[PDB]
Amino acid sequence: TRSAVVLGGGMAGMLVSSMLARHVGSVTVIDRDAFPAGPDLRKGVPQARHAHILWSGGARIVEELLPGTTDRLLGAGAHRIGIPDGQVSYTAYGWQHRFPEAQFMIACSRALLDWTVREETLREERIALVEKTEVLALLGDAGRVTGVRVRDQESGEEREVPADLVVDTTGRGSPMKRLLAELGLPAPEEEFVDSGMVYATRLFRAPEAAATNFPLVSVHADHRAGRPGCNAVLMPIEDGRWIVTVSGTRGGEPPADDEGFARFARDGVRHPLVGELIAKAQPLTSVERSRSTVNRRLHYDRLATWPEGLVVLGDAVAAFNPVYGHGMSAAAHSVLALRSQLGQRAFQPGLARAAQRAIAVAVDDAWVLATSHDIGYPGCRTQTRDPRLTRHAGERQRVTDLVGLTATRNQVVNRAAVALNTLSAGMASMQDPAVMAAVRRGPEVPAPTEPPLRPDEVARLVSGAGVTA
Ligand SMILES: Cc1cc2nc3c(=O)[nH]c(=O)nc-3n(C[C@H](O)[C@H](O)[C@H](O)COP(=O)(O)OP(=O)(O)OC[C@H]3O[C@@H](n4cnc5c(N)ncnc54)[C@H](O)[C@@H]3O)c2cc1C
Ligand SMILES: [Cl-]
The missing domain is CATH 3.50.50.60 (FAD/NAD(P)-binding domain)
Known part of the structure; x- marks a missing residue:
C-alpha cells in the first residue's frame, strides 16, 4: 500500500x-x-x-540499509582504512600520532x-x-x-x-x-559560507608493492593562519590506483595544468609529503577541477x-x-x-x-x-543568522583548537575527535567528563618530527629492481 x-x-x-x-x-x-x-x-x-571519503558514520548506515555492500565493495578492490592507525595527516596542529583503530573509512x-x-x-x-x-x-x-x-x-x-x-x-x-x-x-531562508575552494584531481598508478595496505595521506591547511587554506590528499582506490586531490581557497586556487599540479602538492601546501609520494607513481589522467x-x-x-x-x-x-x-x-x-x-x-x-x-x-x-573552519579564510563570503558562526564564533574556536591540538597526541581525546568527525557520535559527546579530563591531562606522546610513516610502508614505494647481487 x-x-x-x-x-x-x-x-x-x-x-x-x-x-x-x-x-x-x-x-x-x-x-x-x-x-x-x-x-x-x-x-x-x-x-x-574527485576523491570521495566514506566515513564510518555513513558506511555503517549504508551497511544497515543494504547488507553486504561493504564486503561487496571490498571484493571490488575498495580499501578499509582505519582511523587514525591508517592515516598520515599533517593536521593544522601537527602530525597526528597513529593510535590504534578508533574509527574507519572506505576508500574507492x-x-x-x-x-x-x-x-x-x-x-x-x-x-x-x-x-x-x-x-x-x-x-x-x-x-x-x-x-x-x-x-x-x-x-x-x-x-x-x-x-x-x-x-x-x-x-x-x-x-x-x-x-x-x-x-x-x-x-x-538561504544560509551559505563561501570560501572559494577549488579542487584539482589527478589519478596515479601506485607502485606495485603499495597497491595494497597503503595509508590515507593528507596535508591539511591551518585554519587559524591568515593565509589561503590549501590541502593535499592521497587516497588509495581500487585496481592499484591513487587518487590525488589538491585544493585551495580564494587567492590560492590550484592550477589546471599537469606541471603546476605537482608543484602545488609540494610547495602549495604546508608539507610536501603528497608531492614526494606522487613522484613514485605514474600519472594516468589530466587535471580535473571543481568549484562546488x-x-x-x-x-x-x-x-x-x-x-x-x-x-x-x-x-x-x-x-x-x-x-x-x-x-x-x-x-x-x-x-x-x-x-x-x-x-x-x-x-x-x-x-x-x-x-x-x-x-x-x-x-x-x-x-x-x-x-x-571555513569562515576564517581570507575573502570568505558568508550569509548567515547562526550565532555559532557569528557572535560566539571566537569562544567556540578556542575550545575546538584546544581539543584538536590534544587529539594529535592523546588517544582518548583522539577517540572522541574522530568519532565526532566521522559523524559516528554527536557534538555532546565532546562534553563527556572522561574526554575533558584527558584534554586536561595533556599529551601522552611526543609531537612527531617527521611524517609518521612506517618503515614497511616506505619500503613498498620502490620495485627493488635491477639488483641481482
Ligand atoms: C568534489 C567533491 C568531492 C566530494 N567528496 C566527498 C567525500 O569525500 N565524502 C563525502 O561524504 N561527500 C563528498 N562530496 C559530497 C557528495 O558527493 C554529495 O554530498 C552527495 O553526492 C549527495 O548526494 P545526493 O544524492 O543528494 O546528490 P547527487 O549524488 O549529486 O545526486 C544527484 C542526482 O540527481 C539527479 N538530478 C540532478 N538535478 C536533477 C533535476 N533537476 N531533475 C532530476 N534529476 C536531477 C542527478 O542526475 C543525480 O543522479 C563531494 C562533493 C564534491 C563536489
Ligand atoms: Cl564537481
Whole structure:
C-alpha cells in the first residue's frame, strides 16, 4: 500500500529508496540522467571525478540499509582504512600520532560506490528507476503534494506520477525553489559560507608493492593562519590506483595544468609529503577541477507553510565543502531521520513537516564542522543568522583548537575527535567528563618530527629492481 516518488537517483536517492521500499508499496525514482551498467562516470554526478571519503558514520548506515555492500565493495578492490592507525595527516596542529583503530573509512572511486549502491538498492523489484526524465511540476497544492508531473526526454510527452510522499534528492542543482514557487509558497531562508575552494584531481598508478595496505595521506591547511587554506590528499582506490586531490581557497586556487599540479602538492601546501609520494607513481589522467565547495543550507523546515507529503534531503537541503568529506554520511543520517519519523507518525498529517525538522537536525553536525573552519579564510563570503558562526564564533574556536591540538597526541581525546568527525557520535559527546579530563591531562606522546610513516610502508614505494647481487 501507498507509493513514493524520489527525485534523483544519486547517493541519497538510492539510500532513501532502499529505506522507503520497506514502508510503502512502490517507489518510483525519477532522474534526468542516463545511467551506466558498470562503475562509470555520468554527467548527473560530475563530482565522481574527485576523491570521495566514506566515513564510518555513513558506511555503517549504508551497511544497515543494504547488507553486504561493504564486503561487496571490498571484493571490488575498495580499501578499509582505519582511523587514525591508517592515516598520515599533517593536521593544522601537527602530525597526528597513529593510535590504534578508533574509527574507519572506505576508500574507492565514487563511480564504483554509486554503481554498487544502486545494484544492491535495485535488487528490490518494487523500486523502479526512470532515467532521462525531466521534473516539470509538483502535483497538488501548497497544502498537500500528491505527485509529480514528468516529461520523457526522447518523446517530449508529459505524464503524472502520483505519490503519497515526494522525496527530493536532486542534489546541489535541485529545482525545489522553482517547483515551490509554482506551488505558491515563498522561498526558504538561504544560509551559505563561501570560501572559494577549488579542487584539482589527478589519478596515479601506485607502485606495485603499495597497491595494497597503503595509508590515507593528507596535508591539511591551518585554519587559524591568515593565509589561503590549501590541502593535499592521497587516497588509495581500487585496481592499484591513487587518487590525488589538491585544493585551495580564494587567492590560492590550484592550477589546471599537469606541471603546476605537482608543484602545488609540494610547495602549495604546508608539507610536501603528497608531492614526494606522487613522484613514485605514474600519472594516468589530466587535471580535473571543481568549484562546488560552498557550504549551502536551505531552511525548508522553518517555512511558514509546508505542504504535506513533501520532503527534501541530501545535497538539495544541505551541501558542504567536500574537504571535510561529510556529504555522503550526512545524507545517510538524513535518511534515518525520515525513517525515524515514519516509524513514529506513519503517514498521518504532520509527517512531512516533522521529517523536515529531523533532517535539519541530522545535518547540523556536518554543517557546523565545515562552516566553523571555513569562515576564517581570507575573502570568505558568508550569509548567515547562526550565532555559532557569528557572535560566539571566537569562544567556540578556542575550545575546538584546544581539543584538536590534544587529539594529535592523546588517544582518548583522539577517540572522541574522530568519532565526532566521522559523524559516528554527536557534538555532546565532546562534553563527556572522561574526554575533558584527558584534554586536561595533556599529551601522552611526543609531537612527531617527521611524517609518521612506517618503515614497511616506505619500503613498498620502490620495485627493488635491477639488483641481482
Ligand atoms: C568534489 C567533491 C568531492 C566530494 N567528496 C566527498 C567525500 O569525500 N565524502 C563525502 O561524504 N561527500 C563528498 N562530496 C559530497 C557528495 O558527493 C554529495 O554530498 C552527495 O553526492 C549527495 O548526494 P545526493 O544524492 O543528494 O546528490 P547527487 O549524488 O549529486 O545526486 C544527484 C542526482 O540527481 C539527479 N538530478 C540532478 N538535478 C536533477 C533535476 N533537476 N531533475 C532530476 N534529476 C536531477 C542527478 O542526475 C543525480 O543522479 C563531494 C562533493 C564534491 C563536489
Ligand atoms: Cl564537481
